[PDB]
C-alpha cells in the first residue's frame, strides 16, 4: 500500500525500521514487506556477543554478514548491537574475574565488530540495559569487575573504531516520565557527556501494554532533555496493537526534534515473543493491520 518509511522521511525523519535476521528474511513474506515499507534493519540476534564471539578472540560473522549484505542490496540503513549487554554473554566472558583482562576483552569485542562493518552501520547500540528499575546501575559482570568506568571505556573505544557511526545507550521501561529509571538515565547521560563521553543517542526499547502510548508523549521529550544529538524508539511492540497507542508513539517522535525514527520489534504477529497479544503491525496473513493504516493516515496529514 503506502510505505511508512517513505512517509516518515517526507515528514523530516530518517527511518521507520524493523528487527530481522536471516531466518525471517527467508521465510514468510518478511523480505517483501521490509523491501516495500521499511527503511532500516536491525539484527535480532546475529550481532549479539554469544553469536559473534563464541570463544575468546574467535569470531563468527556468517549471520551478521548475511543481514548487512541483504540491507546493502536492498538500499536499507543498518543498525547494529548490542556490543556490551549482560543478557547474551557466552560463559567464557561472565567467568572473567580480573579487571584488566575483562577491559581488554570488552575493547577487543567492540573494536572487532565495528571495524568489520566500518562505514556501513548507521547506529550502534554500544551499551544496553545498564540500569536497574530504581535508577542505580545494574550489577553485571562489567560493573562488578571493571567498575562504573566500563561505560565511558565502551563509548570511547567505539568512537575510535568507527567515527562515522552514531553511538547509543539503550534501555527499556523508559516509557513514563515519572518512572525512576527515566530521570536516572537522563541525569547520568548528562553527566557522562559533560565529562566528554561520546554518547550520541538514547534508544528507548519500547514494549507497551494497552493504553501506555499516551505516556510516551511526555517520556520521549524528557529523554531528549539529556542533550544527546539523537533519540529513537527501538524494538517497539504494543499489546493489542491499538491504533491509538501506535499513533501516540509516532506522534511523540514527530514532536521531538532529535527523534530520528522508530524501529518495530518484527513484522508479523505470529513471530512475536508475545503473539497472543497480537502486538505488531502485520497479521498472521502478512496483511497490514488497522494500526498500520492509522500510522499512514497520521503521517499523510
Amino acid at each position: 500500500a503506502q510505505s511508512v518509511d517513505q512517509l516518515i522521511k517526507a515528514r523530516g525523519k530518517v527511518y521507520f525500521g524493523v528487527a530481522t535476521d536471516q531466518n525471517r528474511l527467508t521465510t514468510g513474506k518478511n523480505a517483501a514487506i521490509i523491501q516495500a515499507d521499511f527503511g532500516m534493519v536491525w539484527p535480532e540476534n546475529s550481532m549479539q556477543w554469544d553469536a559473534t564471539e563464541p570463544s575468546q578472540g574467535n569470531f563468527n560473522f556468517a549471520g551478521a554478514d548475511y543481514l548487512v549484505n541483504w540491507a546493502q542490496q536492498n538500499g536499507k540503513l543498518i543498525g547494529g548491537g548490542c556490543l556490551v549487554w549482560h543478557s547474551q554473554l557466552p560463559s567464557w566472558v561472565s567467568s572473567i574475574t580480573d579487571k584488566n583482562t575483562l577491559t581488554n576483552v570488552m575493547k577487543n569485542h567492540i573494536t572487532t565488530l565495528m571495524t568489520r562493518y566500518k562505514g556501513k552501520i548507521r547506529t550502534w547500540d554500544v551499551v544496553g540495559e545498564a540500569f536497574n528499575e530504581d535508577g542505580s546501575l545494574r550489577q553485571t559482570v562489567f560493573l562488578n569487575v571493571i567498575g562504573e568506568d566500563y561505560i565511558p571505556i565502551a563509548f570511547q573505544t567505539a568512537r575510535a573504531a568507527d567515527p562515522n557511526a552514531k553511538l547509543y545507550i539503550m534501555d527499556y521501561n523508559l516509557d513514563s516520565a515519572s518512572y525512576p529509571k527515566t530521570q536516572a538515565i537522563v541525569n547520568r547521560v548528562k553527566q557522562w557527556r559533560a565529562a566528554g563521553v561520546p554518547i550520541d543517542g538514547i534508544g528507548s526499547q519500547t514494549h507497551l501494554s494497552a493504553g501506555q502510548g499516551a505516556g510516551v508523549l511526555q517520556a520521549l521529550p524528557l529523554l531528549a532533555s539529556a542533550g544527546t544529538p539523537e533519540v529513537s524508539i527501538l524494538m517497539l511492540d504494543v499489546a493489542g496493537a491499538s491504533p491509538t497507542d501506535y499513533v501516540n508513539v509516532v506522534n511523540a517522535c514527530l514532536n521531538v526534534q532529535s527523534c530520528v525514527g522508530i524501529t518495530v520489534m518484527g513484522v508479523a504477529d505470529p513471530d512475536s515473543v508475545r503473539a497472543s497479544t497480537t502486538p505488531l503491525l502485520f497479521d498472521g496473513n502478512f496483511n497490514p493491520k488497522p494500526a498500520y493504516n492509522a500510522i499512514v493516515q497520521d503521517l499523510q496529514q
Side-chain angles (χ1 to χ4, degrees), residues 97 99 102 138-148 150:
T97 62
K99 177 177 186 169
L102 192 58
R138 185 188 293 275
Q139 295 173 321
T140 68
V141 66
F142 301 104
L143 189 74
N144 292 342
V145 172
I146 300 176
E148 296 193 353
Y150 88 92

Side-chain angles (χ1 to χ4, degrees), residues 27-240:
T27 56
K29 294 184 184 182
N30 297 299
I33 289 164
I34 296 171
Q35 285 168 335
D37 298 324
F38 293 95
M40 185 170 194
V41 293
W42 291 74
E44 304 172 329
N45 292 297
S46 66
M47 294 186 194
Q48 305 297 352
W49 200 313
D50 58 353
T52 54
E53 203 187 350
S55 74
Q56 188 169 347
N58 280 52
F59 290 79
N60 184 348
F61 291 115
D65 281 353
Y66 186 96
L67 182 62
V68 168
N69 179 76
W70 188 92
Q72 293 197 307
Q73 292 178 180
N74 288 275
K76 308 303 182 187
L77 294 167
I78 312 171
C82 191
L83 293 172
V84 183
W85 188 23
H86 66 288
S87 286
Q88 290 183 224
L89 284 180
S91 54
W92 67 265
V93 178
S94 56
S95 68
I96 294 169
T97 62
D98 179 78
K99 177 177 186 169
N100 193 251
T101 300
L102 192 58
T103 301
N104 283 339
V105 158
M106 187 186 71
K107 289 176 78 171
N108 182 239
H109 186 76
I110 292 167
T111 299
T112 298
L113 262 71
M114 293 186 69
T115 300
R116 182 174 187 83
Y117 305 116
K118 195 178 181 188
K120 300 179 173 182
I121 306 298
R122 183 202 190 273
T123 299
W124 278 99
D125 282 342
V126 179
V127 174
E129 303 184 358
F131 286 80
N132 287 317
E133 299 307 304
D134 69 5
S136 64
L137 291 176
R138 185 188 293 275
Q139 295 173 321
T140 68
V141 66
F142 301 104
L143 189 74
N144 292 342
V145 172
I146 300 176
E148 296 193 353
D149 285 341
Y150 88 92
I151 290 168
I153 294 169
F155 279 94
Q156 293 164 331
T157 300
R159 175 70 97 231
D162 186 357
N164 178 245
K166 308 295 171 174
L167 308 179
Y168 279 48
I169 189 163
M170 162 275 270
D171 223 319
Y172 64 91
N173 284 344
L174 311 176
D175 310 303
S176 169
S178 60
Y179 194 66
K181 204 178 194 185
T182 311
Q183 187 65 49
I185 193 163
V186 169
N187 281 358
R188 293 309 293 266
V189 169
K190 290 173 69 167
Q191 288 161 346
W192 279 321
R193 286 179 47 80
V197 182
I199 301 173
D200 300 315
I202 302 173
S204 185
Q205 173 199 325
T206 302
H207 301 298
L208 300 180
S209 301
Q212 292 183 334
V216 180
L217 291 166
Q218 288 77 49
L220 192 63
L222 186 59
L223 288 178
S225 81
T228 58
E230 301 187 353
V231 300
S232 75
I233 299 290
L234 184 76
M235 303 305 169
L236 170 66
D237 75 336
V238 183

